[PDB]
């Protein structure tokens, strides 16, 4: 294709005028990595961000590794060429966490908030963390919030593991979001809101009436089909009730997410379109456990 | 060491006089490593258990990896040197999603029943689900168990992601098991059992008493401290309540595990110990999703 070929053209172009590097994981698309100056894995990702003179970074990848690279770039523009379970660890986890078990480390997978990574010892990806957790002196070790690589790495270290956010809890209600609640308007606009007290304050301002599970069985009388925020069987079960209800979410996870394209680095370059910011406070915070796991890899 | 020397001169000897060959993971121990046979990531795993010739393989390595060569090769014998959140998924989470998105693939990551592969079209591991996924030709895909993978490839492929299981729903009732009975038992051996009706049948047989979340919070009169089967926010509040609990599971996650040592691949050969097994019904159906991730990686 001609369209191609002019694409790349601007995009090497581009590349000169803003000062950019463009770093592209290994799993995206072969024609980002071919403008890509760098390509890699997360880790080797990471390192290659600590090395960047340029003013400008592309990072063609996942958010949380994006973001990871800013946290190495303060001073830079990171920028991600498309528009955007890793919220479910808070910081009071690793508080609770660290009262109980207080001489364990805090290893975090890098799918994480910022806020959280300046509370840990140590980042991990998949392909370092048994590397790492086992080149910890502790044989007890606090990690999140990725079940299944905790799991995993407990089976192959045989390390004591405790999980954040800790296992033996529900945590529905907090999986609800603001962007959740304006879909459910966007969408569905002729409809009122449910919303179940346990949810994000965020979630619960907009929320039109606030009811708990017996509260949403009974004010269910209000509006013909409703938008409920809680269990989805609780979908089911006014929808038997009152056959005169739609989930809050939809069963696909991360929907609307597009593939990065050609065109979105081209656009992104172009636009200097969509930086990634973290706040200094918490970056340089958080900074000390990436850079950390970079020493041990 | 000389201890180690001669492990490794009877592991030598027992590779001939059983006819095994070894396989270890990357993540697994060096010294583990040494005496291999053949090293490698979970696919090239998968891949070298399909061109076994030997009448024994010796799986260094995690639990469900070990079941997938196992699958591969029904008319050997597959040993895991070591004693043993994947039985999350049913086979009716497979049936309702394959209802509501007909002309949808499943794809399961590895980490997953042999029941439930029985029910799958390709499996995938961490490193090749994004370029399997891609691949099909569907832009819905059903994918579990494992929902950090389902985002992630979400995020990268922009397609769109149906989880199994489903999400919006609370499976913390699920996550018991006989074995986390018995345990309950061996430890506090002078104490009885409350668990939640929402409990694996299994579970609910070995129950003392049965009861909901409200028979708890009253029938916590006979016994000075119990063994909740439910939710820990129940451990609290019935302590709370009544000062004159434990919870069922430890905040630890698989733990009991031990890392698999020099040692266990010597006793592993010696006493052909712990040996992997599938009912062939099952495996002949669940090992064609695996070959299938074969061609296409
Ligand atoms: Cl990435
Ligand atoms: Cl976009
Ligand atoms: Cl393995
Ligand atoms: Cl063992």
Request: charged letters at 30%; aromatic letters at 6%; a neutral charge.
């Amino acid at each position: 294709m001609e369209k191609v070929e002019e694409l790349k053209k601007e995009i090497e172009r581009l590349k000169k005028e803003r000062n950019a590097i463009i770093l592209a994981h290994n799993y995206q698309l072969p024609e980002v990595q071919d403008v890509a100056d760098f390509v890699g894995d997360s880790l080797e990702l990471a390192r290659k961000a600590t090395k960047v003179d340029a003013d400008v970074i592309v990072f063609a990848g996942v958010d949380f590794m994006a973001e990871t690279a800013k946290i190495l770039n303060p001073d830079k523009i990171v920028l991600i060429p498309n528009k955007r379970m890793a919220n479910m660890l808070k910081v009071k986890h690793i508080l609770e966490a660290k009262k109980k078990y207080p001489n364990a480390p805090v290893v975090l997978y890098v799918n994480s908030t910022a806020e959280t990574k300046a509370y840990a010892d140590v980042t991990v990806t998949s392909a370092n963390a048994v590397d790492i957790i086992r080149k910890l002196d502790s044989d007890v070790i606090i990690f999140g919030p990725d079940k299944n690589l905790a799991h995993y790495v407990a089976k192959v270290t045989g390390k004591t593991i405790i999980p954040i956010p800790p296992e033996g809890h529900c945590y529905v209600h907090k999986k609800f979001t603001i962007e959740d609640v304006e879909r459910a308007k966007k969408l569905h606009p002729n409809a009122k809101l449910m919303v179940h007290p346990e949810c994000n304050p965020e979630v619960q301002e907009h929320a039109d009436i606030i009811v708990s599970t017996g509260g949403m069985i009974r004010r269910a009388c209000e509006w013909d089909e409703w938008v409920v925020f809680t269990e989805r069987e609780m979908v089911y079960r006014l929808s038997k009730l009152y056959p005169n209800f739609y989930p809050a979410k939809e069963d696909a996870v991360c929907v609307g997410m597009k593939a990065i394209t050609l065109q979105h680095v081209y656009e992104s370059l172009r636009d200097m379109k969509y930086e990634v910011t973290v706040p200094e406070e918490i970056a340089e915070k958080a900074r000390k456990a990436i850079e950390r796991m970079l020493e041990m890899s």
